[PDB]
Design a protein around this ligand. Structure first.
Ligand code: HEM
Ligand code: HEM
Ligand SMILES: [N+]
Ligand SMILES: [N+]
Lengths: 137, 137
């Protein structure tokens, strides 16, 4: 289930973080503009840029912490607040986050690795609701 | 994105080249008049002609190079010049090129693969503008 999925992802965080992040940018190419250093780079090209590995690592580490602190795929109000208040997310709306989770769920469904994809969909919806409660437009 | 799409196509070049070129010819069957020995043949008959596979490969090899040398899907002027000045292209107008890119973009949208179709549309439009600047009618 969801908790095991967190263990799956954490076990090979670099690979899953990079895979899912690329799935996100490739599914929603207009999202790439937020990451100006990734413009004009193929998947394999990004995988040798230090910042790309570091960014995806840090993002998915945090996402897993929020996931782990959730109850029944409902994230904590304080965690939603952390995500809204981050300077790096100041220009974002909840639509950006929906897109990420749609891509993430599609990735999991397409994987050969078992995942509780429905629970990640639910988590994404609940996080979107929490981001709104916390003041993201 | 666009840069990744170049890798995707190069990773199965012969197959994508023939499939995209066939989409082009089937969408615009009167374009066959610029070629030799294509009329009156099905997709499979075309794919069994040695010259067909070799032509499509050479076209797509070069097209991917032009894409790869571009910045933000804007091709180099010298690449546009080369395409205009090729003896094989002497009787073409930019309309021929726009049709090829309409078919290519349509192919990408219809595919099961995550292409950045809008960036290929821009690339086609930018190529046409560049071909015009290079003197193609
Ligand atoms: C739950 C989902 C998300 C989490 C946990 C998360 C987490 C993070 C973290 C930890 C950083 C800082 C990383 C570092 O300092 O290296 C960061 C930066 C950033 N995030 Fe997010 N993020 C999420 C969703 C999104 C979405 C959906 C977008 C926009 C499409 C986005 C856009 C950005 C941008 C542009 C930066 C700055 C990166 C840079 O300057 O190189 N984030 N995020
Ligand atoms: C960016 C788009 C295009 C690229 C990269 C491209 C590239 C090429 C290349 C590499 C060749 C082979 C020349 C040689 O063997 O030395 C070729 C030949 C040719 N191309 Fe293109 N081409 C493009 C668009 C077009 C279009 C739109 C048409 C017509 C609708 C066209 C018509 C032809 C013809 C008629 C030949 C000669 C074929 C023959 O041997 O009978 N090309 N092209
Ligand atoms: N990946
Ligand atoms: N195809």
């Amino acid at each position: 289930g969801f908790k095991q999925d967190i263990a799956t992802i954490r076990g090979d965080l670099r690979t899953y973080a990079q895979d899912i992040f690329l799935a996100f940018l490739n599914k929603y190419p207009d999202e790439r503009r937020y990451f100006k250093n990734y413009v004009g780079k193929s998947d394999q090209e990004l995988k040798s840029m230090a910042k790309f590995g570091d960014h995806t690592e840090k993002v998915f580490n945090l996402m897993m912490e929020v996931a782990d602190r959730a109850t029944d795929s409902v994230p904590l109000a304080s965690d939603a607040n952390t995500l809204v208040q981050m300077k790096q997310h100041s220009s974002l709306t909840t639509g950006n986050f929906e897109k990420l989770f749609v891509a993430l769920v599609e990735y999991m469904r397409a994987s050969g690795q078992s995942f509780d994809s429905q629970s990640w969909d639910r988590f994404g919806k609940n996080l979107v609701s929490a981001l709104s409660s916390a003041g993201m437009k």
